[PDB]
Amino acid sequence: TDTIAALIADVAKANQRLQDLSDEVQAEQESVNKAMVDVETARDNAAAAEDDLEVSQRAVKDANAAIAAAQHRFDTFAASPDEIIATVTAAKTLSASSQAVMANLQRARTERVNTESAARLAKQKADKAAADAKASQDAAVAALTETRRKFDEQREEVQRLAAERDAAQARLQAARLVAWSS
Amino acid sequence: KRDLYTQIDRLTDQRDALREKLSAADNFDIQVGSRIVHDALVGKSVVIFRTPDAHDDDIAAVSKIVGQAGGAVTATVSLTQEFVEANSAEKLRSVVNSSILPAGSQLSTKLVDQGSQAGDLLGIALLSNADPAAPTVEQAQRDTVLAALRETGFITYQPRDRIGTANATVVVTGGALSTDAGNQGVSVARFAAALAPRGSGTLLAGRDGSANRPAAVAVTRADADMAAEISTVDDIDAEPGRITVILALHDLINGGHVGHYGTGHGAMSVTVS
């Protein structure tokens, strides 16, 4: 069993495994690079979805303030005998107009709240895609280091076997010369 | 006739005979109630809303008949006096038009009164849209809407935890309103109308006298828009009225047919056909 032809075939089988592990390391390094890019695009989308949410939140803040400012005019307006009959007459004359102004502002406010609601869902989806992109980059990095350690382990086994084949071939050429000289 | 004594006795005997016939008629209806509503709500769920003037015995009768129909009651939400009086309208709308609106859900932008907006948000939280494209609201999302409306004093609810989604809804009121409490009719009629598109049908049920203004049932029947959006019952205080809540809820869930039932003003018939 301990023939040089068998030892050479053993190095050839070990070296084929080493070649396969090298091929897997290169392919998995490409996966880590692809995943690294996907993380950056998903993080950009999540940052852009946060800007859309901040813009919509500010618009809600403005719409709420416009309703408060309309209510403040109506309240300050309401706040002498003939002068109080005149205040009530004026307020009752503009009452339905004040209701229509307020209804318009309330509808505008709900429309901004609906835009923010859609944006909140888009922010949650973008964050979930950014977290899923990181989960893939982490699963690819961990798979690459596992193939890299199997590769390092196989490279040392191939070096050990090739050193044995080289030493046996060196002993064969030396033994052939000692026999040939006699 | 000038025989006043014999008229009183004859009228007392006639009234007493009708009272006996009526007690028997109501006992007949209680005893066959489960036969009438058999399979009317099988696989379906109902969320109950009640106003401060609604009677506990009506809520309990509706909830018992839902069970007889093969259905379930997900919760009984009590609309507080702070909600129905409509004097906290802006506080209400600032709660509804906030981040409590489940992410991605859209509030209706048509009617902006506090009744319509509260029913629209509670319809999102507690009902299942007949449209599969609409969002499925999570348990945590529903609880958020409920706790915000309960901390601000608009609603009270049982059970306090793990409330499920409902197919249809009943809004239960009392009878006649005093003219000074007229705001309660409009706010509850609009509240009930805004729940109609959020699920598979809303029935607004009131006790005798609810078919008269300013009560919610009368406000609904007199408004062409609301009279076309929700069904009504004006005699929930009586057993035929309680059975009709379930029979007309069946019609809404299976076909969407709207009707106005009872013995009062604007009622098209006593019950479904």
Numbering used by the authors:
A (entry chain A): 43 to 121, 137 to 239
B (entry chain B): 41 to 313
From the paper:
D,L-endopeptidase RipA is the major PG hydrolase required for daughter cell separation in Mycobacterium tuberculosis ( Mtb ), as RipA defects severely hinder cell division and increase antibiotic vulnerability. Despite extensive studies, the mechanisms governing Mtb RipA regulation remain controversial and poorly understood. Here, we report an integrative structural and functional analysis of the SteAB system, a regulatory complex that has been shown to modulate cell separation in the model organism Corynebacterium glutamicum ( Cglu ) and is conserved across Mycobacteriales .
In addition, crystallographic characterization of the cytoplasmic core of SteA revealed a homodimeric organization harboring a conserved functional pocket similar to the phosphonucleotide-binding site of thiamine pyrophosphokinase. These data, coupled with the in vivo phenotypic analysis of a steAB knockout mutant of Cglu , support a model in which the transmembrane SteAB heterotetramer, driven by cytoplasmic ligand binding, orchestrates the productive periplasmic positioning of RipA, leading to PG hydrolysis activation.
